[PDB]
């Protein structure tokens, strides 16, 4: 016996109002335009638990295929979230005993027609509950379980990157446009150990698709949350998935603070990125295939970065043999505090396990230390 999600995962402290109430209040109808999932490429359609006019339909198919994009295991992870987070008790009762046993079950198993029974069943059961009371529990959630956002925005990337995700890979003559990606379970973790937090700016230089950028918004609810990316098929996968964000995010009452983007542009001379970078809290940059020429120009764009800013990078960004000389000075490399940690498995994209990541705060003074002597289920 297992569950789509991991009931004993750990939970997200809420840091700004996520739920808008007063949205839900005021609004009954959704009249957004999401992707389908059945039209990408018997079935089965899931009731919105806010919305009752939007239903979205799935195909549901065992045999064929299945593995990374999985509609029954998206359906089985939104059924549990709404057991888990979007009911009030009674309601959590009645649906967790009702409905997860069979719908776990008849998946496990391959069995279409139990499957499907347990999703009818469960739409039956969430139109019979009040839907004033779903809101104001809503209005109680202080807390989320770190997977929600992640499952979430994988939805929001399965509709919209997924179908075109070989446009990304095309033939790089330089390493520095190679796309690579860093996933949500290593950025949570990266974001806590900056104290990434409400209020906060945050940039990604060279944001690829925007994963980075979006998740750093709705974890954190930073005040911005800003993204540069050169190639041009990252540039319009990421409208793409920005445009169907913003859909889900208001078909579950969900706020998407201040995103933006600076696309089909090199953040090198970069305007926006150069009048951003005294504000940044946190910076993001995966410089893990970048040489040595372009590390060059990522090291004049932060020299104006603030003091406590915290610099994220898959390679450091100062020599390992930085000394303090006479040409090097003035540069904010020299009051840099770096910090290097080891990647958990499944961190990033291009690799299973082992690698490193640093961090690198920004110190008011410098280090004397530089003188020279002289993308499954749970139990
Ligand atoms: N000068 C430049 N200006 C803008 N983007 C650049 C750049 N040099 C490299 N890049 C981009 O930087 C990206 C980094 S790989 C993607 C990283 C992204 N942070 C994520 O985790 O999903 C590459 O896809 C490449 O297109």
């Given at each position: 016996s297992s569950t789509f999600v991991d009931w004993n995962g750990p939970c997200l402290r809420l840091q700004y109002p996520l739920f808008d109430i007063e949205y839900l209040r005021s609004h009954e109808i959704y009249s957004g335009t999401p992707i389908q999932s059945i039209s990408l490429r018997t079935t089965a359609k899931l009731q919105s638990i806010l919305f009752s006019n939007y239903m979205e339909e799935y195909k549901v198919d065992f045999k064929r295929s299945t593995a990374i994009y999985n509609p029954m295991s998206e359906i089985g992870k939104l059924i549990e979230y709404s057991c888990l987070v979007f009911l009030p008790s009674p309601y959590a009762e009645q649906l967790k005993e009702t409905i997860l046993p069979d719908l776990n079950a008849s998946f496990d198993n391959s069995d279409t027609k139990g499957f499907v029974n347990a999703i009818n069943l469960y739409n039956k059961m969430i139109r019979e509950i009040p839907r004033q009371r779903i809101?104001?529990?809503?209005?109680?959630?202080?807390?989320?379980?770190?997977?929600?956002?992640?499952?979430?925005?994988?939805?929001?990337?399965?509709?919209?990157?997924?179908?075109?995700?070989?446009?990304?890979?095309?033939?790089?003559?330089?390493?520095?446009?190679?796309?690579?990606?860093?996933?949500?379970?290593?950025?949570?973790?990266?974001?806590?150990?900056?104290?990434?937090?409400?209020?906060?700016?945050?940039?990604?230089?060279?944001?690829?698709?925007?994963?980075?950028?979006?998740?750093?918004?709705?974890?954190?609810?930073?005040?911005?949350?800003?993204?540069?990316?050169?190639?041009?098929?990252?540039?319009?996968?990421?409208?793409?998935?920005?445009?169907?964000?913003?859909?889900?995010?208001?078909?579950?009452?969900?706020?998407?603070?201040?995103?933006?983007?600076?696309?089909?542009?090199?953040?090198?001379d970069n305007n926006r990125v150069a009048e951003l970078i005294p504000q940044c809290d946190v910076i993001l940059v995966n410089n893990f295939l970048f040489d040595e020429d372009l590390n060059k120009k990522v090291e004049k764009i932060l020299q104006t970065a603030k003091v406590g800013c915290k610099i994220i990078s898959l390679k450091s960004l100062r020599s390992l043999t930085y000394q303090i000389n006479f040409y090097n000075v003035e540069n904010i490399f020299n009051r840099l505090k770096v910090q290097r940690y080891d990647l958990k498995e499944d961190s990033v994209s291009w690799t299973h396990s082992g690698g490193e990541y640093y961090i690198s705060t920004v110190m008011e003074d410098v280090d004397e230390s530089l003188f020279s002597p002289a993308r499954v289920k749970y139990t």
């Open positions: 809101i104001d529990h809503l209005e109680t959630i202080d807390k989320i379980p770190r997977s929600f956002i992640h499952d979430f925005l994988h939805i929001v990337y399965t509709r919209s990157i997924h179908p075109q995700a070989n446009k990304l890979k095309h033939y790089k003559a330089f390493s520095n446009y190679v796309y690579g990606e860093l996933l949500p379970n290593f950025l949570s973790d990266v974001y806590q150990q900056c104290q990434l937090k409400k209020g906060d700016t945050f940039m990604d230089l060279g944001s690829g698709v925007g994963n980075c950028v979006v998740q750093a918004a709705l974890e954190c609810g930073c005040a911005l949350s800003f993204g540069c990316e050169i190639m041009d098929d990252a540039s319009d996968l990421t409208i793409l998935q920005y445009e169907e964000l913003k859909k889900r995010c208001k078909l579950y009452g969900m706020r998407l603070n201040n995103v933006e983007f600076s696309l089909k542009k090199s953040f090198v």
